Amino acid sequence: ALSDLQVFNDWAYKTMSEVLDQQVELFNGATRGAIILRSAGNTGDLSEAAFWA
Amino acid sequence: ALSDLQVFNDWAYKTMSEVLDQQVELFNGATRGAIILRSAGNTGDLSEAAFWA
Protein backbone atom coordinates (compact mmCIF):
# COMPACT_ATOMS: atom_id res chain seq x y z
CA ALA A 1 0.00 0.00 0.00
CA LEU A 2 1.09 3.58 0.62
CA SER A 3 4.55 4.04 2.10
CA ASP A 4 5.41 7.75 1.69
CA LEU A 5 8.83 6.99 3.19
CA GLN A 6 10.47 8.86 0.30
CA VAL A 7 9.53 12.42 1.29
CA PHE A 8 9.09 13.61 4.88
CA ASN A 9 7.15 16.86 4.68
CA ASP A 10 6.79 16.59 8.46
CA TRP A 11 7.85 13.98 10.99
CA ALA A 12 5.40 11.07 10.72
CA TYR A 13 3.21 13.45 8.72
CA LYS A 14 0.04 11.35 8.74
CA THR A 15 2.20 8.68 7.12
CA MET A 16 0.75 5.69 8.99
CA SER A 17 -1.16 4.92 12.15
CA GLU A 18 -2.44 1.42 11.24
CA VAL A 19 -5.82 3.03 11.64
CA LEU A 20 -7.93 -0.13 11.41
CA ASP A 21 -7.79 -3.67 10.06
CA GLN A 22 -11.53 -4.53 9.90
CA GLN A 23 -13.93 -3.53 7.07
CA VAL A 24 -16.35 -1.03 8.73
CA GLU A 25 -17.89 0.53 5.57
CA LEU A 26 -21.26 -1.21 6.24
CA PHE A 27 -23.78 1.65 6.72
CA ASN A 28 -26.81 2.97 4.73
CA GLY A 29 -26.23 2.21 1.00
CA ALA A 30 -23.15 0.10 1.87
CA THR A 31 -25.58 -2.32 3.61
CA ARG A 32 -28.33 -1.51 1.03
CA GLY A 33 -30.25 0.25 3.86
CA ALA A 34 -30.01 -2.85 6.10
CA ILE A 35 -27.75 -0.99 8.61
CA ILE A 36 -28.80 2.69 8.20
CA LEU A 37 -26.39 5.20 9.85
CA ARG A 38 -28.33 8.42 10.66
CA SER A 39 -27.86 11.62 12.71
CA ALA A 40 -30.99 12.66 14.64
CA GLY A 41 -30.85 13.22 18.38
CA ASN A 42 -33.48 12.25 20.94
CA THR A 43 -33.72 12.78 24.68
CA GLY A 44 -33.69 10.46 27.67
CA ASP A 45 -32.39 6.92 27.41
CA LEU A 46 -35.07 5.50 25.09
CA SER A 47 -37.25 6.24 22.07
CA GLU A 48 -40.75 4.76 22.12
CA ALA A 49 -43.15 4.71 19.17
CA ALA A 50 -46.67 3.29 19.19
CA PHE A 51 -48.48 1.64 16.29
CA TRP A 52 -51.72 -0.30 16.02
CA ALA A 53 -51.83 -4.10 16.11
CA ALA B 1 41.11 -31.87 -57.73
CA LEU B 2 40.08 -30.15 -54.50
CA SER B 3 43.14 -31.51 -52.68
CA ASP B 4 45.45 -29.29 -54.74
CA LEU B 5 43.44 -26.15 -53.93
CA GLN B 6 44.05 -24.26 -50.69
CA VAL B 7 40.55 -23.89 -49.24
CA PHE B 8 39.73 -21.25 -46.64
CA ASN B 9 36.66 -21.46 -44.43
CA ASP B 10 34.54 -18.40 -43.73
CA TRP B 11 34.75 -16.66 -40.37
CA ALA B 12 33.15 -13.61 -38.82
CA TYR B 13 32.61 -11.81 -35.52
CA LYS B 14 28.87 -11.38 -35.02
CA THR B 15 29.44 -8.80 -32.21
CA MET B 16 26.84 -10.06 -29.75
CA SER B 17 26.64 -11.16 -26.13
CA GLU B 18 23.89 -12.84 -24.12
CA VAL B 19 22.57 -10.75 -21.24
CA LEU B 20 21.16 -13.46 -18.95
CA ASP B 21 18.81 -16.45 -18.76
CA GLN B 22 15.93 -15.54 -16.44
CA GLN B 23 13.39 -12.74 -16.95
CA VAL B 24 14.06 -9.44 -15.18
CA GLU B 25 11.65 -7.26 -17.17
CA LEU B 26 8.81 -8.53 -14.98
CA PHE B 27 9.76 -6.26 -12.09
CA ASN B 28 7.68 -3.05 -11.96
CA GLY B 29 4.52 -1.98 -13.73
CA ALA B 30 4.36 -5.55 -14.98
CA THR B 31 3.68 -6.40 -11.32
CA ARG B 32 1.17 -3.58 -10.65
CA GLY B 33 3.42 -1.86 -8.12
CA ALA B 34 4.04 -4.98 -6.04
CA ILE B 35 7.78 -4.46 -6.58
CA ILE B 36 9.06 -0.89 -6.92
CA LEU B 37 12.27 0.57 -8.36
CA ARG B 38 12.39 4.17 -7.19
CA SER B 39 15.57 6.24 -7.33
CA ALA B 40 15.92 7.51 -3.77
CA GLY B 41 19.06 6.43 -1.93
CA ASN B 42 19.70 6.50 1.80
CA THR B 43 22.90 7.30 3.67
CA GLY B 44 24.49 5.26 6.40
CA ASP B 45 23.59 1.58 6.34
CA LEU B 46 19.91 1.82 7.26
CA SER B 47 16.85 4.07 7.42
CA GLU B 48 13.89 4.30 9.80
CA ALA B 49 10.46 5.86 10.31
CA ALA B 50 7.77 5.77 13.01
CA PHE B 51 4.01 5.28 12.71
CA TRP B 52 2.69 5.06 16.30
CA ALA B 53 1.28 1.50 16.18
Resolution in A: 3.7
A5 touches chain B (CB under 8 A): yes
B37 CB within 8 Å of a chain A CB: no
Q: Where are the alpha helices (DSSP H) in B1-53?
A: none
Asked whether B51 and A17 are in contact (CB, 8 A), the reply is yes
Q: How far away is chain B from the Cα of A37, in angstroms, using its nearest Cα?
A: 29
Angle A31-A32-A38 (CA atoms, 0-180°, nearest 5)? 70
**By the CB < 8 Å criterion, does B42 face chain A?**
no
Q: From which experimental method does this structure derive?
A: cryo-EM
Sequence length of chain A is: 53
The total number of residues written for chain B in this structure? 53
CB–CB contact A17 B52 (8 Å): yes
